[PDB]
């Protein structure tokens, strides 16, 4: 047979994420159960008892040979087994082998879960996994409509933070990237924008990481300065260490060379007593799985892969082995030497496979003409979606992923502008797709967006600045606009100055005053 089920999970005791992970491990170990998709991780206000620790919540989609009743027993076994060394595992919905929702109303078991339409912490992660046309079996209304209805009440009690796990550090509490969303109807990120500082460990151009190249002591001092500049106005900073050039047609450092450039420097930052370690997050810009693996060993938090797994087929396997590492899935085409030729987006690669496209949970066939105005962002969204599907198929968890539409990567200067304008569409883009004899639903809602506009050629074209070094002021303006269009993180060169821009844009657009 193989039936389908959606289960809600939650914990508000101790290491909540470890309780969740253990429950998912226990499910997966069953011969009768197959994990298909997991939602983002959300933090929510306790619904019933406000004096308690906030809950960590999500949803998991499984394929199972078990009957509803057999599955419920397993959920109870798991809850008990976890208590042995604190986790709730409920059946939310259960579909038969034909993909139809079943209803059970027995003394012991009620499917769908009787409380689900009351709880944003159920519906939000659930609707990351089910499409806008999925109806509630009892009400016959789309579940997304029931979600919208809850948000429409405008109770801050119903508000969710999304948490993206970061690695544990000794003596430190569990670490996350955090994103709070609010509604007004439109949904908007209202927590501070993350600043990612660029650090190039390449010899490429004297003006940018050029002179201190291969000198770890000098480089570290540069990084201490960056952190001080950023932390003046911000609570956190990400330092993105890059040992490989990603500029169109640039010669590629060897792996051994990239490792030598990046890894000792990450080790040195992480070991520094001159840095406030708790406010400093470490990223490595690499498309190489082995470099990522080495970086993880020396205490990196984020793998920033401009190819989204395209350059190394073992990258996803590395990320999958490290559930507390954060992975940036960036959009590109071809490779570094050919991408310039591939900036053409009229035709849709997976066009034939696409069954249905949705913007803000509405079929775009019914938002007529929007389709014609959003060719580029939907094309980029589908290609990000395809990378995402392959990541999930290779053990990467949705909860680990940030997305980046990849400004400048197989895109012209006019296209980069259009991508900035259309971030709100991207953030609310979803589609169903035929994939290996069965249907798959890709939902970009809640996937935090990183943009890297800094010093890019597209700015220079408009401001007539030939040299990249003189594009910092203009970058300030563009960064403000990126945030205004919904960017959750920005990658920048001029940290001291862009920090001011980010803070102002956050005040203006987010009310963070
Ligand atoms: N935010 C939040 N509040 C809560 N309050 C009670 C229960 C326990 O619910 P059950 O007894 O129906 O499983 N679970 C949650 C939860 O998961 N999240
Ligand atoms: N995630 C992400 N990573 C990147 N790495 C390098 C560059 C090229 O810029 P640089 O050569 O000035 O670092 N741009 C990006 C980007 O836009 N997004």
* Cα separation, 203 vs 498, whole angstroms: 24
Contact 283, 237 (CB under 8 A): no
Which residues have CB under 8 Å from 469's CB, separation 6+? 207, 208, 455
| Token code pair at residue 212 | 């201190």
CA separation (Å) from 99 to 33, 75, 102, 105, 439?
17, 21, 9, 19, 10
Contact 359, 381 (CB under 8 A): no
* Cα separation, 490 vs 497, whole angstroms: 13
Side by side, the strands of the sheet bearing 489-492 are 401-404, 326-330, 302-305, 280-285, 237-242, 194-200, 489-492, 450-451
Complete DSSP assignment for 192-237: PPEEEEEEE-S-SSTTTTTTTTT-HHHHHHHHHHHHHHHHTT-S-E
Looking at the structure, tell me whether residues 466 and 363 fall in a common domain: yes
Evaluate: CB of 202 within 6 angstroms of ligand 2.
no
Domain CATH code at residue 226: 3.20.20.20
* Cα separation, 453 vs 421, whole angstroms: 13
| Token code pair at residue 263 | 């890894």
At what resolution in Å was this solved?
2.3
* Cα separation, 297 vs 291, whole angstroms: 10
Evaluate: CB of 324 within 6 angstroms of ligand 2.
no
Looking at the structure, tell me whether residues 66 and 203 fall in a common domain: no
- The alpha-carbon radius of gyration of the chain (Å, integer) is 23
- Rounded to 5 degrees, φ, ψ at 363 are -50, 125
Looking at the structure, tell me whether residues 320 and 245 fall in a common domain: yes
Looking at the structure, tell me whether residues 326 and 453 fall in a common domain: yes
Strand partners, 94: 5
Looking at the structure, tell me whether residues 180 and 223 fall in a common domain: no
Q: Dihedral sign for Cα 349, 352, 354, 359, please.
A: positive
* Cα separation, 274 vs 269, whole angstroms: 9
Residues in the chain: 513
Looking at the structure, tell me whether residues 261 and 315 fall in a common domain: yes
| Token code pair at residue 330 | 């960036």
Looking at the structure, tell me whether residues 282 and 255 fall in a common domain: yes
What is the signed CA dihedral for 339, 343, 348, 349, rounded to 10 degrees?
A: -10
Instruction: Give start and end residues of each alpha helix (H) in 321-374.
Output: 370-373
510 in a known ligand binding site: no
Q: Return the ligand number nearest the Cα of 205.
A: 2
- CA of 304, closest atom in ligand 2: 1
> Which domain covers residue 481, as residue numbers?
192-513
Kindly give the distance from the C-alpha atom of residue 307 to the centroid of ligand 2, in angstroms, as a whole number: 11
* Cα separation, 189 vs 340, whole angstroms: 33
Q: Return the ligand number nearest the Cα of 285.
A: 2
- Residues contacting ligand 1 via CB (< 6 Å): 10, 44-48, 55, 57, 88, 90, 115, 121
* β-bridge pairing 401-404 and 326-330: parallel
Evaluate: CB of 407 within 6 angstroms of ligand 2.
yes
Looking at the structure, tell me whether residues 173 and 269 fall in a common domain: no
* Cα separation, 408 vs 339, whole angstroms: 9
CB atoms within 10 A of CB 260: 15
Looking at the structure, tell me whether residues 200 and 175 fall in a common domain: no
CA separation (Å) from 398 to 57, 206, 379?
14, 39, 21
Residue where the block lists tokens 């990000």: 384
249 in a known ligand binding site: no
- Rounded to 5 degrees, φ, ψ at 170 are -50, 135
* Coil vs helix vs strand at 423: helix
Evaluate: CB of 250 within 6 angstroms of ligand 2.
no
Looking at the structure, tell me whether residues 141 and 67 fall in a common domain: yes
* Cα separation, 163 vs 181, whole angstroms: 12
Residue where the block lists tokens 């060897």: 254
Which residues have CB under 8 Å from 303's CB, separation 6+? 283, 284, 286, 292, 295, 296, 315, 318, 319, 325, 326, 327, 328
Evaluate: CB of 197 within 6 angstroms of ligand 2.
no
From the list 485, 460, 483, the residue with the least C-alpha distance to 472 is: 460
Contact 298, 250 (CB under 8 A): no
* Domain boundary, last residue among 166, 191, 216: 191
Looking at the structure, tell me whether residues 238 and 363 fall in a common domain: yes
CA separation (Å) from 505 to 137, 476, 484, 486, 501?
44, 10, 7, 11, 6
| Number of structural domains found in the chain | 2
* β-bridge pairing 401-404 and 302-305: unpaired
* Cα separation, 152 vs 160, whole angstroms: 14
Kindly give the distance from the C-alpha atom of residue 59 to the centroid of ligand 1, in angstroms, as a whole number: 13
Contact 165, 400 (CB under 8 A): yes
* Domain boundary, last residue among 157, 191, 225: 191
| Token code pair at residue 87 | 């986790």
Kindly give the distance from the C-alpha atom of residue 183 to the centroid of ligand 1, in angstroms, as a whole number: 22
Looking at the structure, tell me whether residues 381 and 250 fall in a common domain: yes
Contact 445, 427 (CB under 8 A): yes
* Domain boundary, last residue among 141, 171, 191: 191
Domain CATH code at residue 137: 3.30.70.560
Evaluate: CB of 450 within 6 angstroms of ligand 2.
yes
Residue where the block lists tokens 């029931």: 146
The preferred substitution site among 10, 79, 109 for testing ligand 1, maximizing ligand atoms within 8 Å of CB, is: 10
Kindly give the distance from the C-alpha atom of residue 273 to the centroid of ligand 2, in angstroms, as a whole number: 29
């Amino acid at each position: 047979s193989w039936k389908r089920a959606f289960l809600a999970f939650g914990s508000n005791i101790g290491d909540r994420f470890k309780h969740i992970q253990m429950a998912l491990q226990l499910l997966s170990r069953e011969k009768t159960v197959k994990l298909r998709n997991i939602s983002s991780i959300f933090e929510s206000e306790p619904m019933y008892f406000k004096d308690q620790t906030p809950f960590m919540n999500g949803c998991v989609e499984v394929e199972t040979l078990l009957t509803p009743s057999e599955l419920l027993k397993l959920c109870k076994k798991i809850e008990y087994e976890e208590l042995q060394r604190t986790i709730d595992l409920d059946i939310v919905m259960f579909l038969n082998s034909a993909g139809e929702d079943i209803i059970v109303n027995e003394p012991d078991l009620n499917i769908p879960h009787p409380r689900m339409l009351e709880r944003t912490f159920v519906l939000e992660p659930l609707c990351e996994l089910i499409s806008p046309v999925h109806l509630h079996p009892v009400t016959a209304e789309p579940i997304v409509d029931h979600l919208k209805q809850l948000y429409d009440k405008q109770h801050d009690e119903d508000t969710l933070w999304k948490l993206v796990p970061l690695p544990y550090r000794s003596g430190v509490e569990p670490r996350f990237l955090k994103f709070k969303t609010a509604t007004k109807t439109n949904r908007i990120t209202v927590s501070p924008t993350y600043i990612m500082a660029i650090f190039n460990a390449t010899p490429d151009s004297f003006s940018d990481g050029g002179e201190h190249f291969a000198d770890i002591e000098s480089q570290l001092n540069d990084i201490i300065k960056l952190c001080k500049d950023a932390l003046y106005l911000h609570e956190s900073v990400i330092i993105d260490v890059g040992g490989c050039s990603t500029r169109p047609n640039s010669i590629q450092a060897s792996e051994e060379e990239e490792i030598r450039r990046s890894i000792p420097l990450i080790k040195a930052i992480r070991e520094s007593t001159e840095l406030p370690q708790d406010k400093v997050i470490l990223s490595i810009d690499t498309y190489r799985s082995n470099v990522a693996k080495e970086a993880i060993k020396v205490g990196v938090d984020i793998i920033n892969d401009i190819s989204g797994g395209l350059f190394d087929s073992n990258m996803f396997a590395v990320i999958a082995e490290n559930p507390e590492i954060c992975y940036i899935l960036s959009h590109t085409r071809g490779d570094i030497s050919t991408m310039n030729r591939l900036a053409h987006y009229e035709n849709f690669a997976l066009g034939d496979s696409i069954q249905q496209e949705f913007v803000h949970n509405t079929d775009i066939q019914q938002l007529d003409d929007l389709k014609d105005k959003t060719v580029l962002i939907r094309n980029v969204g589908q290609e990000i979606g395809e990378r995402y599907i392959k990541a999930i198929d290779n053990g990467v968890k949705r909860w680990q992923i940030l997305i980046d539409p990849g400004l400048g990567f197989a895109k012209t200067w006019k296209q980069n502008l259009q991508i900035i304008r259309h971030i709100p569409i991207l953030k609310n883009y979803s589609f169903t797709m035929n994939s290996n004899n069965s249907q798959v639903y890709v939902n970009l809602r809640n996937m935090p967006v990183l943009l890297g506009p800094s010093r890019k050629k597209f700015i220079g074209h408009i401001t007539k600045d030939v040299d990249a070094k003189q594009r910092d002021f203009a970058t300030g303006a563009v960064v403000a606009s990126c945030i205004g269009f919904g960017s959750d993180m920005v990658r920048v060169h001029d940290v001291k100055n862009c920090s001011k821009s980010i803070k102002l844009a956050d005040a203006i657009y987010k009310g963070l005053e």
